[PDB]
Amino acid sequence: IKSRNIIGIYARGKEAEGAFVEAEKAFAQAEDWDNAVRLRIEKLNDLHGAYVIVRQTRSANAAALVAKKCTAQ
């Protein structure tokens, strides 16, 4: 399935199962960077990971958010 909107509701219930490793590997399996951008910064606290995601995606919104975060901090 290539529908990420389905996965966006599917993965929320996957946290209750307690399979953190399975959810983490399914995030890369589905390439769900949309939640990963927030999750790595908040839960994992990986600014270098955020830079890697920005380089892989080159999204204008992600670049603007990273610039705002760098200027604020």
UniProtKB/TrEMBL annotation:
What are the boundaries of the signal sequence? none
Q: Where is the protein situated, by its record's location annotation?
A: Cell projection, Cilium
Protein name as it appears in the record: Wd repeat-containing protein 19
Q: Which residues of the full protein are shown?
A: 919 to 991 of 1376
